[PDB]
Ligand binder design. Structure first.
Ligand SMILES: [Zn+2]
Ligand SMILES: [Zn+2]
Ligand SMILES: [Zn+2]
Ligand SMILES: [Zn+2]
Lengths: 185, 190, 185, 179
């Protein structure tokens, strides 16, 4: 179904995902960050761990990608296989991509799936090169579809007591799915 | 709206889930059934907020749930953020686990722990009563899970198969248990 | 006036014509321009040229007002026109706004091949303030590329060449034209 | 870039391209130029424009260095080329020399259509001193008029009977004056 977690004042989904859900990836400065996640680890022996949460900052020094591997998921035990899933407003920056690539390369027992609301500086060749290397590192990257936003809303956004799509929730998806596919293949 | 779910079991009755699955048992020295539910809330004064909720479970764990948590779930702590952890276990920690908890609570001052146990693990042992008291000394908050707590864990951790179409079926001695263990923990801690 | 090895227009505008606006570092820069000053008295000045750098410390926008057009004489009215690969960065925008504000007798028209970080709110705010400063910003259409090619690119051999359009020359323009408009007005 | 209602280059270079000083501070100015700056390091600069006035207080030569290229990037090496109707006067030559003297990273090339009062001994002195300052002077060849016509005049060639004869004529005069 979906439980509480993120406490916010915004009531409308469209407003939440368009403002509060924003995660700045500007190559410079220390802007704001936001990121929801899901972790599920399986171990051949009856060992199972599945947590879920989120992280945000008004003026974080490090980007969401960094903070995650620095305080949320510091180390992994070899005996387990992790299936991490991220939900961010846009694709990572060139630098962050490299950081993710070096992490996945050190942790073979870690599978990562990043679902983005839209692409970030997709037209730039630097970003495109980083996304390819990222896909080559085994990191599966996809665009968030209407069902995804609804999922995040009902499962990550705390309620107290019905999701509602907006303007071009479907057209934005299809657009970026095409662009992400062209570059990745 | 009531809750999502990350735990999957074939048990449809909560009375059974909290009797078997939720249970913690040490068969042998390095072979014990572990199970622990938790919630993390971190505020770092500056817009930086952190929140999550998960669980752990093993059938051949070499260590108890309490040890497994601080060794893989929250190994690191952001000195900037103020952590507020809440656990949901079947029974209070043992003498050894209490120490680990105390030593960790001693190291990180930005960490605050709340343990909600379903029952008191061997409260008759004077060694156990000593741990509970020292645990409170370290600043750890201990409480007996109230009937509302079991319902909370059930609707926010256990994945409902039919989505939002099921309430909560408490067991006959759900209150006597709480009341019973509340009196005990009280005498011990104060 | 521009001496290059590239023969095909598509290749030129997609690589050699690129002007990096990355908020940080000292990347490459490129910029073609046109200047026309009129003065009530028979005074007329009309020059045309371009500027480029492999690793410039300042962006094209800066270099222009620091060495190409340092000062303006009040008795004249300038009609400057730029031709760059993408729209300016937030910082550069401010620089352009402060310049236009000091030189009332300066009109600026910036024609861009595409938008840069258009989706970011920081960039959108800068573009509006830019339009409010009197700076007219528009997207380059097929005719524009052809113009720049035949007028700024030195022909391999005087009277022995032609412009060749590329697959998405129209679709790309129509996309950013619609985007720039939405944000601007 | 240049726009005129003259369809024949023979007329454009006879009237419009001409430079005349009616009075002390009122003279018809007109100058075509090209700028090429290389700053060893990937930094390249190139442009081409022109100047024209009907009531200019100064000559085209003065107007250029005072508004067109007031500043010079000490890093870049400048290569300027002018296309004027006549060689500079005694006064203008000095300005040119003084400027060429200040900026050592500047190299000038003046392509004149004819020699401005080459008979004056004062003028012959300026031309020589101009070469001393490192300035390169040359008489516009028939090819030059065609170059300026198809790269400066916004059209849409046609040489005149004496186009070659004039070049040769002033070419010899200029030579005897310098070396
Ligand atoms: Zn980043
Ligand atoms: Zn224990
Ligand atoms: Zn810029
Ligand atoms: Zn003169």
């Amino acid at each position: 179904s979906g439980g509480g977690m993120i406490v916010t004042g915004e009531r409308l989904p469209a407003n939440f995902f368009k403002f509060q859900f924003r995660n700045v990836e500007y190559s410079s400065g220390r802007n704001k960050t936001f990121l929801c996640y899901v972790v599920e680890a399986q171990g051949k022996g009856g060992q199972v761990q599945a947590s879920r949460g989120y992280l945000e900052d008004e003026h974080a020094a490090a980007h969401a990608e960094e903070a995650f591997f620095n305080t949320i998921l510091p180390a992994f035990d070899p005996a387990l296989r992790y299936n991490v899933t991220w939900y961010v407003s846009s694709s990572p920056c060139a630098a962050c991509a490299d950081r993710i690539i070096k992490t996945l390369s050190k942790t073979k027992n870690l599978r990562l799936l990043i679902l983005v609301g839209r692409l970030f500086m997709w037209e730039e060749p630097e970003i495109q090169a980083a996304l390819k290397k990222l896909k080559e590192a085994g990191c599966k990257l996809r665009i968030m579809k209407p069902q995804d936003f609804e999922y995040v809303w009902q499962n990550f956004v705390e309620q107290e007591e019905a999701f509602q799509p907006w303007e071009d929730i479907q057209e934005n998806f299809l657009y970026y799915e095409e662009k992400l596919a062209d570059i990745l293949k």
